[model samples]
Target: NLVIALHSYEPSHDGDLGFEKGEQLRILEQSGEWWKAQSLTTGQEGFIPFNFVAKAN
Candidate 1:
């Protein structure tokens, strides 16, 4: 598994990442439809829809 502090989760996403929203993004493991990630910059934790989440390869 290749984990990287990528620029943004959504392509063509303008402006700052989640950090600007007072939410820091942290890389967490993925399981099923839930992709867990932590926000170091904001200390917020949540899960993303892994069903459509993909990498650029």
Candidate 2:
């Protein structure tokens, strides 16, 4: 699935990925509140809070 960051997020944990608002992301896993996603802009992968992103159109 595809999504877009709704707000900027800074990595607060070892596996967290930082992203800026409007950045495109590809969902790798969506099991809970924190979803594993890859940043399309940087090709980086890590966990991101689900609420920080919205479904991409």
Candidate 3:
């Protein structure tokens, strides 16, 4: 799985992907300002802010 070098910068949309201090994301698709990713801890898949999230890998 591909995990992005990302984290929960601050309190954002509840529907967005939330991660720990040193967490990454597994993305399946990306579009405009949203992206589909899976949480390595929760095993949940959902859309997160593309601009702020889905960053460096």
Candidate 4:
């Protein structure tokens, strides 16, 4: 991931993670348009939109 977050995503919006922009995260799983991830700084886990992230090797 690219520490990417152009918009704030909250749990109230059905978001599993509430991370600020520029937070580092790792891809853990994917289902449909949702991706399960873990925060590198917080060790938090949640789901986010695939479109909101840029994949990298």
Candidate 5:
């Protein structure tokens, strides 16, 4: 499967936008299938897919 980009969106209200692209963050926990992603930009934390990002091998 092709893992394309999941562009970020800025919403007008809460829960309106779901992602932020090219932003910096720190990984909190190493889950089996995912990691807890905390945004350094907004200080928001959430569970993100492990395959959601990766470096070229």
Candidate 6:
């Protein structure tokens, strides 16, 4: 699944993925408030806040 960031985020912990608003991401797994996703721009995978992003389409 794909999602677009709604706001820029800075990772506060080791496992978090930092991303900017409007960036595209690939969801690897969904787990409640946090989701594992990969940044299409940097190809980096990490956990992100589910509320920070929305379905790309």
Quick one: best lDDT, which candidate? 6
lDDT of 3: 0.61
- Candidate 6 regions off by >4 Å? none
- Give lDDT for model 6: 0.90
Error of 6 at 23 (Å): 0.7
Q: Residues 1-57, candidate 6, lDDT per residue (tens digit)?
A: 999999989999679899999888899987878999898999899999988889987
lDDT values for all models? 0.43, 0.89, 0.61, 0.66, 0.45, 0.90
lDDT of 1 by residue, 1-57 (tens): 322343344422332223232223454757765556555655455554443334424
What is the per-residue lDDT of model 3 for residues 1-57, given as tens digits with 9 covering 90 to 100?
455544554436666666555566677677666776787778567766665454544
| Residue range 11-53, candidate 4, lDDT tens digits | 5446576666555568777667777778778868888776666
Q: Tens digit of lDDT per residue, candidate 5, span 1-57?
A: 112114453433432223455544455654655545555567566655544543222
Q: Give me the displacement of residue 33 in model 2, in angstroms.
A: 0.7
Clash count, one per candidate: 3, 0, 0, 0, 0, 0
- Per-residue lDDT, model 1, residue 11, is 24
Between prediction 2 and prediction 5, which has the larger lDDT?
A: 2
User: Candidate 4 at residue 14, lDDT?
Assistant: 61
Residue-level lDDT tens digits of model 2 in 17-46: 889987878989988999999989897999
Q: TM-score of every model?
A: 0.38, 0.91, 0.57, 0.66, 0.52, 0.91
Residue range with the least summed lDDT across 10 consecutive positions in model 5: 1-10
* Candidate 5: segments with Cα more than 4 A from true spot: 1-18, 55-57
How far is 14's C-alpha from truth in model 4 (Å)? Answer: 5.3
Checking candidate 1 for backbone clashes, the offending pairs are 24-39, 24-42, 26-38
As for candidate 5, its clashing pairs are none
Candidate 5 yields a Cα-based lDDT of 0.45
Once model 4 is optimally superposed onto the true structure by TM-score, how far is the C-alpha of residue 37 displaced, in angstroms?
A: 0.6
